[PDB]
Structure formats: structure tokens, C-alpha cells
Amino acid sequence: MKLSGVELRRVQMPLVAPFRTSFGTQSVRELLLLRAVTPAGEGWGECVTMAGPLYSSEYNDGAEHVLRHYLIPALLAAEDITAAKVTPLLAKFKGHRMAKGALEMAVLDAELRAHERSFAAELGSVRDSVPCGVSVGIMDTIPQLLDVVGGYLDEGYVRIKLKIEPGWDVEPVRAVRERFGDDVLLQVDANTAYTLGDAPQLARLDPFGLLLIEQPLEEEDVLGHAELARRIQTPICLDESIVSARAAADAIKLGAVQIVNIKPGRVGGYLEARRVHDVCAAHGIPVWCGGMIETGLGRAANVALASLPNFTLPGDTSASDRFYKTDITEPFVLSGGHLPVPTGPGLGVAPIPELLDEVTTAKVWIGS
Amino acid sequence: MKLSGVELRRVQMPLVAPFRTSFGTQSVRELLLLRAVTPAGEGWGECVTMAGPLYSSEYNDGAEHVLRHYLIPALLAAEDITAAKVTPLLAKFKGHRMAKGALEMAVLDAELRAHERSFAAELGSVRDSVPCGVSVGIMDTIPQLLDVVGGYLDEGYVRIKLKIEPGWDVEPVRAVRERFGDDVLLQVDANTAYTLGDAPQLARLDPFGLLLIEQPLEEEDVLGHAELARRIQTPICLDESIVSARAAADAIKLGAVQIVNIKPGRVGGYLEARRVHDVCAAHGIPVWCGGMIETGLGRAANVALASLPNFTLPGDTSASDRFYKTDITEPFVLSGGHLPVPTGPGLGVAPIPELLDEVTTAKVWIGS
Amino acid sequence: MKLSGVELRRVQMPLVAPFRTSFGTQSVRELLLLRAVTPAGEGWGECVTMAGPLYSSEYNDGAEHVLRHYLIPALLAAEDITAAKVTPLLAKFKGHRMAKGALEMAVLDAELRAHERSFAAELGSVRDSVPCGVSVGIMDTIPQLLDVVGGYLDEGYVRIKLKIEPGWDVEPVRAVRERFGDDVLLQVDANTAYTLGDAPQLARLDPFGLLLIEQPLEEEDVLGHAELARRIQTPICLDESIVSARAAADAIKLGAVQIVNIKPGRVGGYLEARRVHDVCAAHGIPVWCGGMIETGLGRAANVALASLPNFTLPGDTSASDRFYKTDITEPFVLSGGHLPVPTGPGLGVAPIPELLDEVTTAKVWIGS
Amino acid sequence: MKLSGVELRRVQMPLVAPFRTSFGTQSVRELLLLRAVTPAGEGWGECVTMAGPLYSSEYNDGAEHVLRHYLIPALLAAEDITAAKVTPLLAKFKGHRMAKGALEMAVLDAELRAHERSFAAELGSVRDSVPCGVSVGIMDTIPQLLDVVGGYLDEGYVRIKLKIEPGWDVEPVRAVRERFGDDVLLQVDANTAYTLGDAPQLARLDPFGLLLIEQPLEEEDVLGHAELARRIQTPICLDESIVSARAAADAIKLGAVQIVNIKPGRVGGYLEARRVHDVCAAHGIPVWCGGMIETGLGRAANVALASLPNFTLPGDTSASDRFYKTDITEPFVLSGGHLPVPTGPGLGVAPIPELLDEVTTAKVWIGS
Ligand SMILES: CSCC[C@H](NC(C)=O)C(=O)O
Ligand SMILES: CSCC[C@H](NC(C)=O)C(=O)O
Ligand SMILES: CSCC[C@H](NC(C)=O)C(=O)O
Ligand SMILES: CSCC[C@H](NC(C)=O)C(=O)O
Ligand SMILES: [Mg+2]
Ligand SMILES: [Mg+2]
Ligand SMILES: [Mg+2]
Ligand SMILES: [Mg+2]
């Protein structure tokens, strides 16, 4: 491969239903898409960044900037390009994992299509379909919340995940467990909302039989999680914290994590994500696929990933309709609480031009 | 893919020069080669077992049997096959890593060729050539040993590794450091010949500035290695003990190893081997490619693997001629202490039929 | 002694009722038998290997090959032979414990009968009988199980073992505890069937008061068990993982075991079995005899071992008729939950020829 | 068997040359012998206790007593008697290991002699000869010492042990290293003479390259030895502290010992001794036979013992003439630093009555 250039697209997609988290509400999804361009064909990449630096320090406009001025250029400059080589090529730039992962993807997509290979084959899928769960937002009311869960539960979702915030913890759970029963697959997500000093509160959930608690404390607070793990019964699961395989190895080493949520862009690439999977696996730590409310592009790479062997817990790989009415690709449709792993070269999906143009807000071409 | 069958060959290659280890003297190499047949095309796999069970429990005749009666059959009996599904497919059978790795190899090649991909591309190479060291056996005399060293040193080999054994330790090493200097890459390999009680004697090599000592103790003695490490200055490197990515992680966690020698057949396959690479890498453990006196087939696969990012040490990927006068494939030729990584699909190499047939002793077809 | 040769015999013995494990079901029992020939007399040995590598990497055909080609001949070669010297004579060959164990036994039996001493004598017995429990397969139904359990309880079986498997854990347990009570000697066996990631479900068994969980995880996952052991209540027991006294020690050392199932063949001989016993003892770890569905031959020397001092828990030494209608020896009959330790020299029992020949499929001589 | 009775003798052998320890000068050796009297044949036993309670609380007369009144009787009362059973039989009695040791020994001998078995055979010997070193007492002068040593060195002794005491440490060492060279197997023996507070002085030996320091501190000070092992280069050897297999296990687990000195009587028998060996082995702890200035009666058994596998270091099994001018059995002669392992049943040696009666100072029957 030889990099000809990339096309940076901004994309706005209205959410079907506002999505509330510890960091706020989301009614509309701005994304960043990349179209890799090589002499042979095209490759698409999606960036998980958001408008503002709320989940992380990375935001859309900042991603754009680095990609433009630093990353992309860097790659164009290179004689021979390999997805694998991207890393080494961009190594000199500290951070910007999400952005670097977006780029990698685009390239990899192209690389794979060129060899007629799906993301799944590369990654090492062992399945064809994958159990899906769903992430439910914070509510304003308990019934509003219960109705919703009942909603998703009916659709066939296999697991229920609750966004928590101090103020929306125990109760919400107390509620779902009560209503829906104890056999449901429930788990919660703080997105960093708590402090070690909130332990008791969190210990308040021990009773509820959760599978895990996701990132109760800040991203840098590994030890703290380790400590927290000590004071509570609900299993710790890290997200934000896991920005790499080595991070995972360290957190596991320290006892700060028992289950790992994998988010490909957070870790800087689907490639790195495979390693993380592999590392955890070696340590006996279970992984599951996380989600960034992506279009059908990332959704598709994620489904492929999620079919790896250590993903022994359902992922946030919901169907397309959970967030979008109209997906830029062929939508993802839940079939028996499952999604099928794409079969075509590369992602195994592509944007429906028409669709894409409808939701595009900007564009740009980065060529040498 | 769908497996059509596998041909089993028995090869018998003469050794340029007898090869002495802590387990015994070797003049002729007996191999087991596999040709996996698929709708798509053939694939080649090489098994590292040997005549007897001296390095491990695995031996040629045994691998053959297991292959023939359990493993091949089980794959044949699957609907879809992928190199990656081979593992789960053969998981019901305990052990036989070497045999498994051969088969996966054959599969993988055949699969890679189809997608017109190279082992190296698949594995994640970031290098186009690799530093090669040389494994120097046990000599009858020191002079003899010194000449040989001198010889290899001239061919341009980058590092020297000396087979050791009780009665062939500190001298042979003192002498080589003597002659050749302090600036040479020197390391040693006991092939499990020592005991913890021997620490004192091994402590004797402290002064020579070796890079590592390879498998001082028995295969199952990890804790011993962690202890042993506390007794010597020479860093520990494990070979026989690393039978998996999990083995690796365990040993690392226990402080039993500081550098890992990856051997694909020993760990059940190239795929597993990548995982080890990745695990180590995440724990800051350097790896380096092992060698089992393979033909160009296995040599090729190894060069590819050895071009991965964490192989920060010269491996035992010497030139073909180091062992064999006539290799059944294009020969591997040292260019400035390096060997070039193959570019073609799959192994990037294949057997020269007329050559292969010469060395072939037995063949069999394993189909449905 | 002086080894004159060995008679390999193949034996098929239909099961009294199909025996289902996490690794599959078993209606018949192929076995390997060895008749050790000395200028003085005969010796018998039994190999625990099965048809295929489902419990371990060892299998009947595999053991025969190694015995034939490597092991037996290595002993015949030796000038003077002691059961004790067997080890060091066969040391060059890696692994192959089950086989190595049978041979030893074969040898031992001869050597003893020659000193007019019983296995029990040599091993260091302290009892005259031993309490027997029984291994209870995986059933088709719960009732089916229950009958069976009850059935055994009445025969007089001292303790109950329940083979478990994901999908056959808690319930089958919940049942026996419920129906049969709380004062029954209950323990399970997951023949490696779980994963650390399954802890929670295994945690689900805390309440039943089981004596122990036998081998929840893979053979190689010792640190896993130690971790596991920190997540459940049910004490851990290892079988597969314990291949030697050294293995024992390490496990213990690591906090991955509290009770040890002793399987002489597994560990490579009755002699090593003794050693394990003593090692476990020294660490305050209780042991108990494991069974490998043996003939009266194996069953006899096991009853002998089961009589050592640290065997402080009922072993799997069920009466002959629990599996076999007709034994090649004089049956082992349960007299009030116990079995009598043999009194003759060597094993104490011999094959009832007429009975052998009736169930012997192959035969071979291995002389000079 | 059936114990018919025990004849207790007192013996008094005049040392060749006074032997000085950190506990006192020795001119004559006063032992306790035992004649097990069975229906079949008789057995010999030899107690390592000394005249007074100096090495340990046990002493000749205390021994007699307990034997006579407690021990002997216990066994006679028993219907069935096997050396193995002696231990359970004498359990109720707290301590007196040397005494139980001597007794067991007597029984064992008889038992073995009745199966026509050797001590060796039973214990599991693998060698036929053992490597002997010597125990060099505290001299009055340096030159004196040096002479002796060279004295012993010339006879063919393989390793040198130097008794030490505050004031007899470094110097004496400095002297033998100086004069005799560095490639001498040198080791010391403080017989409990130091304290943790003397670490610095003992650290003073670091330089000499000793194989070990035997029992630097008190019997009960395990943890102190572990601490000590932290403050010194010289590897810690325990003697007095090793009263059992368990104790070995524990001391090792705590890092208080790296080499273990085996004294059969000190541990309560030969059986136990074997176990300690086994234990140590399983933990990669080398062992070596310890001597208590014994006749050709203890000497024999030991020699057998010393032929076990884990006896990786030269024992204190000096030739008969190192202490005694005229042994009560066939003397033991150094053959190239070695001492042949006795081939006859039981100890393989007996006391020459003429010789015996000469040294005996008393006698006594103990029957029913
Ligand atoms: C843009 S919010 C990201 C946080 C995310 N929630 C979901 C359901 O996508 C998670 O932690 O899995
Ligand atoms: C059965 S040989 C195994 C030892 C091998 N060296 C070479 C190149 O032979 C290695 O230890 O890397
Ligand atoms: C043939 S599988 C053997 C496993 C054995 N059970 C019995 C009852 O023999 C055990 O407890 O592991
Ligand atoms: C009176 S000897 C006691 C201590 C003893 N020395 C010898 C030579 O027997 C030893 O440490 O083995
Ligand atoms: Mg999250
Ligand atoms: Mg090696
Ligand atoms: Mg079991
Ligand atoms: Mg001493």
C-alpha cells in the first residue's frame, strides 16, 4: 500500500432518544469519518471522539486537528504502508489514541479489502454471531426507566446495562431487580462518577447480584479500584482506564480489575484491541465489547472483534435502531439477541453515499 | 475453507555437522511435514518434534499418530475451517502442541495464500529483515569450540549461543569471552540440564556478561527458576517452560523469567506464538525467536514471526546452510547478519519437489 | 533383578453402565497391561491411559508405542534393575508418566513378590482396610441421578463424588443435598471444565457444604486455582494438575490447593505417589486416592496406597462390580463401606487367566 | 512381625582423637544400642544420644528410661509390628526422637532382614557408593588445624567441614582457604553458637566461598535464620532445627534454609529421614547426610541413606577409622573418597560380638 490521501468528514446523526450519562446528555451525535485512499481502493475509518472532552481528553475538533496536521501527513510521507506499520509511524506523537485508531482502521479496512479479507478473519473470529446487550441511560424517573428496560428486554436484548450517577445508583437497580427479576443480566456504569470515599454507597449494591460495575472511579485511579474492589462485592470492570494492553496488564496485576471492557478506539485501534483481548485472556480476565454509539461502520468492526474467543460476555453492540433511525450503512438487526458477523472484505459494510451525504456537514481532502 | 485432506510426509535430512545438546548428539534430522489440501489450494506445515522425546514428550511417531487419528480427522469433520478455529476445534485433545501447531501451520499457509497474504503480514511484521544469531553445540574440545565460534563469527552471525551442560559451562564460556572478546553477544542454553542445587556453579557464569541463561532447570520448575534468578546474575530465559501465552504470563508474574524464547511449535502454533509475543510485550519482557532445526518451511515462518515488534533479540534463525547443505526450499542466506523476511503469500516459500522427494521417506493421505 | 522382557497386552472390558464425564461418555474400557518377566518371577502393571487424549495427553496407543520403543527396551538394556532405578533409567524420556507408572508397577510387583512383600508393606501402610466412596457420573436427568446416588448409598458407599460440567453443577447438587440430606459426604469433579471466569457459578455451590471441588480449571492453571480459591468457599482439590510431588509442593506453596487427589499413574508410579503423599502430609494437606476405572490389578495396589497414613478421606476405590461385571482378578467387595488391603506379596492379587484371555485383544513380546 | 523383646546395651568407645565442638570436648563416645528380638531374627539399632543433654535435650540415660518404660513396652503390647507402625504406636509419647529413631531402626533392620531386603533397597538407593567428607573439630591452634585438614585431605576426603565458635570462625577459615586453596569443598558448623546479633561477624565469612553455614543459631530460631540468610552470603544449612519433614517444609517456606542436613536419629528414624529428603527434593533443597559419631551400625544405615537421589552433597559419613580404632562391625573404608553401600539384607552389617562385648558396659532384657 501507498497512501494517496484521506478524506475527513464530519457527520451529525440525531439520536432516536437522548442518551444521558454521568458526564451529561446526548441528543445528537457528531462523528468524524475517514476515507482512506490508496491506488488500489478505499478504506473507511470512524472516530469515537465526541464534541467535547467529557469522557476523555479527546474531542472531535482536536482529533481533526491532529489527524490533519500530524497523523495523516505522517502516513502519507511513508513509502510503504501497513496497518501494522501505522503504529510505529505515528509513535512519535504522544497520545491521541482515538484519532490514531480511526486512521488505523481506515487503512486496515483498505488493506483487508485489498486481500479480500474481513475484519473478522484478521482479528481471529471464532463465532458468526454475537450476543448483544444494551446500555440504558440515566432516567428522570423510575418508571420511565423500568418501561425502557422492559422495552429493550422485549426486543430480545440479552443483557441490561445501567448508567449510574450518584443519585441514580441503588434505587434504579433495586427497581429493575425487583420488577424484572433476578435472572436478568444486569450491570452498571459510573463513567468515573464516584470516589473511593463513596465505597459504602457502592457496597450498597452488593445485594443485587450485578455482574460488574464499570469504571466507578476516575481513569487514573487504578490503585483506588483495586482498593474499592476490596470493599465491595460487585466485580470491578474498567473502561476509560484501559487505554492499552499494558494498562490492562498493569491493572490486572494490581488487582484493580476482574473483567475488561474493550473499546477499540480508546485503546487506539482494532489492532491493539486484539492484544488487550489476548493479554486479558492470558490472565483469565474476561472481556467484552464496549460501544461508542457508532455508525454502522464501527458497529461492524466491533461486531467482528466481539466474536473473538475471550469475549465471553455480551457487548454494547446494540442494533442500529437503538440510536439511529437511519444508519449510513445497511443497518444492524437484532436476531435472537444476536448480530451477525459481517462476511465481506474489510469491514464488510460501506456507507450509502446518499445517506452519508445527508448527514455530512463538512469535508476535506488530505493529499500530499 | 473446508478441509479436503492432509498428506503426511516423513523426511530425513542429514546434518551438515553433528549437533550436540544436553540431551544428545544429532547427525540426521527426521521431520514430519504436512500438506493441507483445500478447495483453495495447498498449505504446508512443519512439525518440530524429533525422533525421540528428549526435548519434550513429543516425538515424531507420536505426533503422526495423533495427527492421523485424532486431529486431522476432527478438522476434516468440521464444516468451516479457519486457521483460527483450529484451536477450539482440537481443544478436546489434551496436549500435543507440536502436532497441533504443524497442522494449524498448514491450514494457515493455505489460507494466507488464498487471500494472497504473507505470514509476516498476518503476524504483524514491522521489519523487512532480521538479525540472526547462531546456536553453537557442545564441543569435544575448547579449541574445536573456538574455531567454530570463530567460523560463525566470520559468516557475520550477530550473537553466539552456547549449548551448555554440567561439565561444559564456565570454561567454554571463559574461553570464548577470552578469544572473541567482551563485545560479542553471548548467551548460553542448558536445555534443563541443571538443578537449583547447581545455582552456585551457575553463579560462576556471572562474570562473563552473558545475555541470558536458557532453561537452566526442568520444564515444570518455574518457581525454581524464580528462585534460581535470585541466586544468579545471568538473566533467566525460558524455553521449554513457555508452552503458552498463559505459561508466559504466569512465569512472568512469578519472576521466573526475564526474556522469553518463542518457539511456535512448542507453544502450539504461530498464532499462539503471536500471543506470547504480545503478552510478554505488555509485561516488558523481550522475546526472541527460537529454532528447531527446521527446513526452509519452518525457517520461513520463523523469520516472519521474528520480524514482529517485540523480538528485540537475535533469534536462532540461522542460514539454511548452517544445518543443511541442500534445503528443500529456496535457501536462507545471511546478508550482513540478517535474513530477509519472505514477501509471497503464505510462507513465502515452498518445497522443490524434486528436492523434497529425495528426502521423503514416507507419505500418506488423510482424507475423509 | 534382571529384565527378561515384557508382555504387552491389550484389554477391553465392557462397563457395567456407561460412564459420563465432562470429557464424554464411556461404555467400554480399553486398557493396557504389562507382564514383567524376570528370571525369578512375573510382575503385573496396569496403565490408566484411555482410548484417547481426553483426560490427559496420554492415550493407549501412545503409551504402548513409548513403552515398546523407548521404555521397555531401556530397561532390558540395564544390567541390574530395581523398581527404584526405573525412574532414573527412564528419565531421559520426557513425560509419559502414565506409561512410566505402569511399568514401574510391573517391576515393583515382581520385586516385591520376590522379597515376599506386599505393595502395602513397602508403601508403609498403617491400616488394614479403607473407606470407599464412589464416583457418580453425569446423568441424563435429576431423578436418574438421585436413584443412582441412593442406589449407591445403600450398597454402603462412604462418600459421594459428582462429576460436574457447565449445565450440571448446582442443581444436581442442590438435589442430592436436599434428598439425601446434609450429612452425606459430598464433593464434585469438574474434570477441568470451568474457567476462572466461571467462579461466580461455582460460587453458587458455596452453600451445599461440599468437601471439595476437584479440578475446576485446566491442568496448567495453578495460579488460576489459587485465585479461584479466593473467590469460592468450596475448598479446592487438584487431580490433573498434580503430576508430581514437586507439582504438589508448588501448588500448595502457591495457595492453589487444600486437598490432593492422588493418582499413581498420573504421577508416574506408586513410588512417586508415595512421595506426593509425604509431601502433602508435611504441609498439612490431606490426600485421597483417585481411581482410573482400573482392573483388580490396579485396584489392588491402590487399596494398598490408600492405606497410608495421610489418606484421610475416602478414595475412589469402589468395588469391582461398580464398573465391571467380571474382573480379571478376584473382585473387590465392599464390606461395610471398606475394602481390604491385600496380604500376599507384591500386588497381592493376580489375574484369573481364564478371565484375562477372555478379554485380551492383543499381545506382544518385548524381549532382548 | 511380633516383637519378642529388646536388649538394651550400653557401649563406650574411646575416640581416636578428642573431638571439640561449640558444646564441649569429647574423649570417649557412650552409646546406646538395641537388639530387637523377633521370632524370625533380630534387628539392630543405634541411638545418637550422648552422655549429657548438650546438642539437644536428649541424653543417653533419659533415652534408656523412656525406651525401657515407655517405648519398648508400647511396641511389645502391639499384636502386629511393622517399622511403619512403630510411629503411630509411639505417637502418644511426646518427643524423644532419637530414642524412637534407634528403636525403629532396630525393628526395621529385622523386618528387612526377614524379606532379605537392604536398608538401601527400602530407602530407594540409586547409587552404589557415596562421596564422603569429613567433620574437622575445633583445634587449639591454627597449625594444628591445618595439619589435620591436609591430613584428612590426603586420605581422600572430598569435602571439609570446620567446627566454629565465636573466636573460632574467620581465622581458621581464612587459614584453610589460604593454605589448601579455593577449590576445596569447605563448609562450617556453629552448632548453635551464634546469635542474629552476630550476623556481622558471620557476614565476615562471605568472602571465603563456603558451601554453607550449618546451624548458626539456636534450634528454635527459624525466623532468625531467615533474617540471617538476608544479612549473609553464605548459604544457610540447618541441622538441629530440622526435627521433621514438617519442620523442613516450614523452614524452607520461610526462607530459613537452602540446604538441609539429614540426621536420621534427630528426625525420629530412617523413615522420617527419607521423608525429609523427599520434602526437600520437592522444594529443590539439596540434602546431605549428617553423622553423630556412630559405630558401623549407624554408619551403615546412613551410607544407605546417603545413596538417595537428593543427597547432592558429601555426607559426614567419614570412614570408621576417623573416630574409632576398632569398630564393632566390619569397618568402613574410604575408596577414593567413597564408601560402598552395604548389599546384605537389613543393615547389611552386624556387630562382631567379640568386639561388641569388649566395649559393652551394661545390658538389659525387655520382654513381656
Ligand atoms: C458515549 S458514552 C460511552 C460510554 C459507554 N456507553 C454506551 C452504552 O455506549 C460505555 O462506557 O460502554
Ligand atoms: C532440539 S534443539 C533445541 C535447542 C534450540 N537450539 C537450536 C538452534 O537447535 C534452542 O534451544 O533454541
Ligand atoms: C476416566 S476419568 C477419571 C477421573 C476420576 N474419576 C473416577 C471415579 O475414576 C477422577 O476423580 O478424576
Ligand atoms: C558431635 S557431632 C554434632 C554436630 C555434627 N558434627 C559431626 C562430625 O557429627 C554435625 O553438625 O553434623
Ligand atoms: Mg463505560
Ligand atoms: Mg532452548
Ligand atoms: Mg478428577
Ligand atoms: Mg551440626
D310 marked as binding residue:
no
| DSSP single-letter state for residue B69 | I
Ligand 4 atom at minimal distance to the Cα of residue D293:
9
Task: Provide the residue range defining the domain that includes A361.
Answer: 1-115+353-368
Q: Is B316 in the pocket of ligand 2 (CB under 6 A)?
A: yes
Q: Is D181 helix (H, G, I), strand (E, B) or coil?
A: coil
B contact chains, 3+ CB pairs < 8 A = A, C, D
Name the residue of B266, B292, B332, B339 whose CB sits within 8 Å of the most ligand 2 atoms, as the mutation to test its pocket. Answer: B292
User: Residue C320: which of C188, C103, C134, C105 has the closest Cα?
Assistant: C134
Choose among B271, B361, B273, B297: nearest CA to B45.
Answer: B297
Read off the C-alpha cell for A194. Answer: 464516584
Q: All 3 cell numbers of residue D325?
A: 580404632
Nearest CA in chain D to C128: D80
A134: which 3 cell numbers?
444494551
DSSP alpha helix (H) spans, chain B: 60-66, 72-76, 86-90, 97-114, 119-123, 142-155, 170-180, 199-203, 222-231, 245-253, 270-283, 296-305, 353-359
Same domain, A218 and A289: yes
Same domain, D173 and D208: yes
B282 inside 8 A of chain A by CB: yes
Question: What type of residue is A216?
Answer: P
Say which amino acid occupies B269. G
Among B49, B191, B217, B263, the mutation site with the greatest number of ligand 2 atoms within 8 A of its Cβ is B191
CA distance C196 to chain A (A): 6
**Quick check: helix, strand or coil at residue B133?**
coil
Type of residue numbered A283: H
What three-state secondary structure class fits B214?
Answer: strand
Hey, are the CB atoms on A126 and B246 less than 8 Å from each other? no
Instruction: List the single residue in C with minimal CA-CA distance to A255.
Output: C227
Measured in whole angstroms, the distance separating CA C235 from the mean position of its chain's CA atoms is 20
Q: Closest ligand 1 atom, CA of A240?
A: 11
Pairing of strands C213-214, C186-189: parallel
For chain D, how many structural domains are there in total? 2
Q: List CB contacts (< 8 A) between C93 and chain B.
A: 52-54, 57
Q: What angle do CA B347, B348, B353 make, to 5 degrees?
A: 85
Q: Is the CB of B111 under 6 A from ligand 2?
A: no
Question: How remote is the CA of residue D189 from the centroid of ligand 8, in Å?
Answer: 6
Residue A135 in marked binding region: yes
- Which run of H or of E encompasses B42? strand B42-47
CA triple D142-D143-D149, angle to 5 deg: 90
* Chains C and B make contact, 3+ CB pairs within 8 Å: yes
Same domain, B156 and B24: no
The CATH number assigned to the domain holding B96 equals 3.30.390.10
Say if residue C192 is in the same domain as residue C202: yes
Q: Are residues B363 and B266 in the same domain?
A: no
Residue identified by cell 516450614 is: D250
Report the alpha-carbon distance of residue D190 to residue A246 in Å, rounded.
Answer: 50
C-alpha cell at D64: 534408656
Does residue C95 contact residue C22 with C-beta atoms inside 8 Å? no
> Does residue D214 line the site of ligand 4, with CB under 6 A?
yes
- Beta bridge partners, B338, equal B131
Q: Do C224 and A286 touch (CB under 8 A)?
A: no
HSE on the CB side for C31, CA within 13 Å?
25
Nearest CA to A244 out of A97, A106, A34 is that of A97
| Contact yes or no for B32/B101 (Cβ under 8 A) | no
Active site residue D163: yes
Q: Resolution in angstroms, to 1 decimal, for this deposition?
A: 2.3
D293 lines ligand 4 (CB under 6 A): yes
Classify B159 in phi/psi space as left (phi over 0), alpha (psi -120 to 50) or beta: beta
Considering the domain architecture, whether residues B65 and B104 belong to the same structural domain is answered as yes
Is C249 within 8 Å of chain D by CB? Answer: yes
Residues A185 and A267 in one domain: yes
Q: How many other β-carbons are positioned within 10 Å of the β-carbon of residue D147?
A: 12
Does D155 lie in the same domain as D68? no
* Residues after which a C–N gap over 2.5 Å breaks chain A: none
The reply to whether A121 and A224 lie within a common domain is yes
Q: How far apart are CA A298 and CA A31, in angstroms?
A: 11
| Residues of C catalogued as catalytic | 163, 263
Q: DSSP letters of C254-282?
A: HT--SEEEE-TTTTTSHHHHHHHHHHHHH
Q: How far apart are CA B138 and CA B145, in angstroms?
A: 8
Residue D227: give its domain's CATH number: 3.20.20.120
Residues D51 and D5 in one domain: yes
Q: Tell me which method was used to determine the 3D structure.
A: X-ray
Sorted by sequence, the CB contacts under 8 Å of residue B104 that are 6+ apart come out as B45, B83, B86, B87, B268, B269, B270, B271
| CA dist., res. D324 & res. D334, Å (int) | 14
Same domain, residue pair D244 and D309: yes
Single-letter code of the amino acid located at B122 = E
Please name the amino acid found at residue A347: L
B155 vs B7: CA distance, rounded Å: 37
B109 is in an annotated binding site: no
Whether the CB of B364 is below 8 Å from some CB of chain A: the reply is no
Mutating to test ligand 4, I would choose from D292, D318, D320, D322 the residue with most ligand atoms within 8 A of its C-beta, which is D292
C123, C286, C312 from C309: Cα distances, Å: 10, 10, 7
Residues D202 and D242 in one domain: yes
CA dihedral of D237, D241, D244, D249, whole degrees rounded to 10: -60
Question: Is D263 marked active-site?
Answer: yes
Q: Of A341, A270, A331, A275, give the one whose Cα is nearest residue A43.
A: A270
B58 lines ligand 2 (CB under 6 A): no
Q: Position of cell 443483557? A: A159
Question: Residues near A53 by Cβ (< 8 Å), separated by ≥ 6?
Answer: A59, A62
CA angle, corner B117, sides to B116 and B119, nearest 5?
140
Helix C270-283 vs helix C97-115: angle between axes, to the nearest 10 degrees?
100
DSSP A92: T
Torsion on CA atoms C306, C308, C313, C315, rounded to nearest 10: -10
Residue reference for cell 558429601 = D314
Contact check, Cβ <8 Å, C247/B220: yes
Q: Which grid cell is A252? A: 490486572
How remote is the CA of residue B190 from the centroid of ligand 6, in Å? 7
> Distance of alpha carbon D147 from its chain centroid, rounded?
25
Measure the CA dihedral D348/D352/D357/D362, to 10°: 0
Chain C interface disruption, residue of B57, B60, B68, B243, most C CBs within 10 A: B57
